[PDB]
């Protein structure tokens, strides 16, 4: 029934992968097309019954965020585009213009009088006005998760199938820096038919090019039969400009960009400016223009030609509707009316395009390719690979996994219940998902914006997580109580949440200690969620104002508990080290929490006067010449002293690590038979370039391979105990630690890298695996594809998006590295897995942003390290270009990216507090994932609507035998079903209503949508 997503190779013409093997990469100069070559055609080819059909298809690009915030580019520029677009396409009824980014849309529409909205929607219904992808932003492809790429879609095109009426079917992606199939997967699940690309590296354009390969039917790198294909269209230039877009010359493309003849201060760098059509130079003009559009057409298949008229913050002024429609119209009247031309061109939009590219392919005219893989890593010329961006801004990078994670389990606790208005609830939620899908945007999650910039996306996610709070606390305050003793105020604050690892200890104080104590408060509740729809259990610690603390679930029964000191580390000035203080006044409690699925559990601390009887308290060891010492207010267990030496450390039954003196995984010891497995961690750094092209925020141009940190003496801290042990170390702007709970150890890092400028600093895994050039990568988190080192390529081009995770194996052996945060990541040798920390970059990459990247500021990465053995498993063949993760590394992505959120009840006393929530809610099979849950109705819906996204993964098969699941029917999660409806991914067509309401499972590597209805 499902495909085989492991051992079939897909049968493609053009295999990315593959392509790259054989690629010269040679940059050569091909005359006017710098990065082509002198495109020749048959001027007989078009003739009276065959003529070339050419669209013009009118844009602005808008970016929401770059150089200018949201707000100050819609003031400043945007809303006028939109108002002149909205009067100029009024009265011109053959002028076109595509849209692509809804935030601004929306922002727009809202503040429009009845009449204009009238207006507006008139000339979308007539087709002048045409929404392309429809999407809040055009997001980010290399950093984003697909979870937020499907948000920010399904969020623009709610808005507008609400207000405009339509759902678009073409994607418009002129600008992300690089493509991902990621792309093409969600858009075809969503209804799209076709999708266009621009940013792809100058040798993919001309290698395609010269094939005609440059329209394919993308399907997804596993799919065997290519039900996952889309029909795409990749731009042949340079650009999106007019220069770029009109042929392969841009002296001559740029004299028809009617807006650089002076007063708009915008010029022709080729040196010839656009010239107002008159009769006396309209043949002329025509002639040189016409040449220009058959030569595009030389690189496609068809005889319907596609060229764009935009660029950035396009068609503002009036003037400049006027200059650009007027003559380009006088253009068309004498092209269309002279025969010996055979072309008919018209302004049209997008989706006009593709409507007759498939009617020529219907009519025989054409067979496309197929194709499969990414277009990483994007070089727009010679050497200037964009890989920066993968790393740029880690903070914000990682404050987006946090909110996608507070986001999605704020729509599931809440979409449990119908609320009454009051409860602000919508309110709430609409804000939060518009702010994550705002920081999609292609210079939001990319660290390319302008440092004022990215504080106002900052602000905005800060807004989005406090109302996700609001959201997931009432929730939870309503689902463990007693209904007749429920007594919200839906401004109160029943819970908080507490978060260990955003933004992090060194990062902000801001996490709550727990005090209790005989005079004032003997005991608290502590609620954990889980958003997995299996049961899980998680370590759990909560800050606590004695050590002296015991754990119970809501049956009374006695939970094992450990307490550790808080440990925080300080860059001593006195001393010149690197070193951890502990707290006197407040201690670490950690226990084993165990949550149905997408369910609650309720756990109580109590302080007593001793140590309690299932509380047992960590040893510490701190490691360092001349050491002093260390007391921990009441702490029971004295901190012990030594010079550094080598230090191995088991949890548990789990794997044995050692360190390096220095702090440092050395080898990992799965059992107590098995070999210790060379792993060493080591931190390196790039430089930048003296003579030559800078590294900036996009561009990563390093000066040769990273050179080792210099480490001298770090002070080496490390706690041992029984269910949570760790190794810390202070090195120079990276506090490093492993910690181990039982199983494959969690990383963090507090990367700090403090006035170093022109640094990038990398974390560097060094093993004895025979990976050879082979090494894998993830997209968006829901793929893993093979990459090839090249050495024809220079280190940056090899280095890739590491949006969740990567791995090297060999026959025997993989480690595999899962990260809580995108970053940009190599294997630049055999056995080596390395990613980026951070970087400091002093100059401009001219790239437009205009300034370096010095606004770092301290945060905490975290990651997980997985060895496993594997020749016991069933792999792709040697041919197949995707990879796939073990359970063990799959859940430990989950850990990293869905761990169990944190809630301690706010007052004194929880009157009417139940134990658990969701103990009936189905455990389902690990590899699946209910993605998304959301109530998409208001309380006064009669019929109640609740859409789910489900999506399963393929785990690799390595003999451990399958156990009993429970199906998971998501129709049957909320009481009173009426119907259940498999839709598209945003929820918004209903594509097979479900015989007996029951929602399918999905296949590997599937995602499904379904809306169940329920009377209310
Ligand atoms: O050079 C790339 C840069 N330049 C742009 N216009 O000049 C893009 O709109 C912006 O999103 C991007 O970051
Ligand atoms: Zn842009």
New binding site residues.
């Given amino acids: 029934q499902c495909q085989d997503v492991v051992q079939d190779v897909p049968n493609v013409d053009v295999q990315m992968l593959e392509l790259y093997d054989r690629m010269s990469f040679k940059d050569i100069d091909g005359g006017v097309w710098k990065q082509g070559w002198n495109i020749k055609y048959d001027p007989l080819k078009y003739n009276a019954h065959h003529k070339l059909k050419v669209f013009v298809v009118p844009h602005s690009?808008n970016?929401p965020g770059?150089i200018q915030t949201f707000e100050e580019y819609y003031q400043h520029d945007t809303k006028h585009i939109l108002s002149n677009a909205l009067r100029h396409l009024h009265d011109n009824p053959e002028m076109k213009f595509i849209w692509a980014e809804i935030s601004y849309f929306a922002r727009f529409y809202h503040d429009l009088g009845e009449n204009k909205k009238l207006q507006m929607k008139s000339i979308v219904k007539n087709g002048q006005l045409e929404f392309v992808t429809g999407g809040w932003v055009m997001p980010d492809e290399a950093n984003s998760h697909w979870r937020n790429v499907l948000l920010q879609l399904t969020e623009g095109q709610t808005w507008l199938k609400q207000f405009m009426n339509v759902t678009p079917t073409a994607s418009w992606a002129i600008?992300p820096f690089g493509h991902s199939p990621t792309m093409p997967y969600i858009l075809q699940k969503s209804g799209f038919k076709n999708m266009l690309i621009q940013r792809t590296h100058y040798s993919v354009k001309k290698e395609l090019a010269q094939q005609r390969q440059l329209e394919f039917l993308w399907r997804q790198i596993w799919d065997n039969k290519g039900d996952t294909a889309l029909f795409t269209h990749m731009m042949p230039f340079y650009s999106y400009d007019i220069p770029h877009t009109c042929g392969p010359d841009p002296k001559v493309c740029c004299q028809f960009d009617f807006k650089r003849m002076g007063s708009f201060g915008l010029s022709c760098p080729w040196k010839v400016p656009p010239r107002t059509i008159s009769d006396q130079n309209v043949a002329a003009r025509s002639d040189l223009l016409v040449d220009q559009w058959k030569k595009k057409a030389e690189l496609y298949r068809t005889n319907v030609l596609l060229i764009p008229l935009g660029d950035?913050f396009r068609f503002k002024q009036n003037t400049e509707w006027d200059v650009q429609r007027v003559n380009y119209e006088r253009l068309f009247e004498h092209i269309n009316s002279q025969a010996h031309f055979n072309v008919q061109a018209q302004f049209g939009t997008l989706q006009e395009y593709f409507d007759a590219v498939h009617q020529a392919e219907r009519a025989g005219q054409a067979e496309f390719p197929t194709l499969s893989g990414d277009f990483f890593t994007y070089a727009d010329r010679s050497d200037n690979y964009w890989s920066g961006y993968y790393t740029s801004r880690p903070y914000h990078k990682r404050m987006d996994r946090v909110l996608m994670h507070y986001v999605r389990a704020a729509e599931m606790l809440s979409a449990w219940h119908s609320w009454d208005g009051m409860a602000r609830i919508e309110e709430r939620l609409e804000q939060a998902r518009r702010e994550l899908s705002l920081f999609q945007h292609?210079?939001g999650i990319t660290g390319?914006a302008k440092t004022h910039v990215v504080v106002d996306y900052e602000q905005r996610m800060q807004e989005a997580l406090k109302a996700c709070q609001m959201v997931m606390q009432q929730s939870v305050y309503r689902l463990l109580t007693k209904p007749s003793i429920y007594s919200p105020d839906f401004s109160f604050s029943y819970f908080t949440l507490d978060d260990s690892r955003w933004p992090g200890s060194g990062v902000e104080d801001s996490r709550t200690t727990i005090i209790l104590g005989e005079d004032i408060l003997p005991s608290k509740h502590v609620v954990m969620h889980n958003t997995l729809p299996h049961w899980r259990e998680q370590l759990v610690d909560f800050y606590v104002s004695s050590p002296f603390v015991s754990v119970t679930d809501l049956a009374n029964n006695p939970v094992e508990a450990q307490v550790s000191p808080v440990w925080s580390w300080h860059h001593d000035t006195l001393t010149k080290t690197i070193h951890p203080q502990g707290s006197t006044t407040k201690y670490r409690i950690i226990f084993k929490a165990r949550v149905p699925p997408m369910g609650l559990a309720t756990y109580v601390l109590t302080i007593s006067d001793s140590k309690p009887e299932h509380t047992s308290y960590a040893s510490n060891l701190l490691l360092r010449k001349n050491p002093t010492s260390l007391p921990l207010g009441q702490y029971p267990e004295d901190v012990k002293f030594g010079d550094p030496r080598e230090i191995s450390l088991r949890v548990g039954n789990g794997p044995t690590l050692a360190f390096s003196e220095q702090g440092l995984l050395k080898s990992i010891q799965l059992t107590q038979d098995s070999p210790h497995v060379p792993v060493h961690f080591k931190f390196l750094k790039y430089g930048v370039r003296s003579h030559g092209d800078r590294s900036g925020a996009?561009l990563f141009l390093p000066n040769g391979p990273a050179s080792p940190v210099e480490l001298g003496q770090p002070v080496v801290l490390v706690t041992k105990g029984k269910l949570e042990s760790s190794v810390s170390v202070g090195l120079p702007s990276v506090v490093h630690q492993t910690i181990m709970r039982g199983g494959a150890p969690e990383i963090r890092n507090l990367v700090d890298i403090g006035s170093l400028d022109n640094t990038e600093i990398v974390m560097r895994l060094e093993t004895h695996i025979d990976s050879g050039d082979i090494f894998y990568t993830d997209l968006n988190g829901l793929q893993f594809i093979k990459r090839r080192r090249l050495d024809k390529l220079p280190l940056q081009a090899n280095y890739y998006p590491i949006p969740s995770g990567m791995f090297i194996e060999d026959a025997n052996t993989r480690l595999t590295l899962l990260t809580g945060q995108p970053l940009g990541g190599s294997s630049l040798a055999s056995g080596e897995l390395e990613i980026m920390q951070d970087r400091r970059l002093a100059s401009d990459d001219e790239?437009?942003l205009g300034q370096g990247v010095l606004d770092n500021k301290p945060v905490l990465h975290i990651y997980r390290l997985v060895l496993e053995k594997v020749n016991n498993c069933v792999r792709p063949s040697k041919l197949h270009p995707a990879g796939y993760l073990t359970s063990a590394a799959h859940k430990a992505s989950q850990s990293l990216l869905d761990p169990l959120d944190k809630f301690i009840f706010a007052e004194n006393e929880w009157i009417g507090a139940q134990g658990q929530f969701g103990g009936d809610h189905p455990s389902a099979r690990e590899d699946l994932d209910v993605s998304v849950m959301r109530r998409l109705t208001k309380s006064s819906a009669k019929t109640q609507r609740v859409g789910y996204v489900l999506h399963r993964t393929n785990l690799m098969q390595c003999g451990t035998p399958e156990e009993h699941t429970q199906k998971l029917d998501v129709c049957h999660l909320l009481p009173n079903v009426a119907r259940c409806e498999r839709t598209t991914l945003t929820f918004l067509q209903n594509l097979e209503h479900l015989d007996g309401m029951v929602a399918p499972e999905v296949c590997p590597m599937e995602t499904a949508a379904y809306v169940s209805s329920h009377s209310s």
């Fill in positions: 690009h970016d770059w600008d950035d292609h210079d390319t996009y790239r437009g």
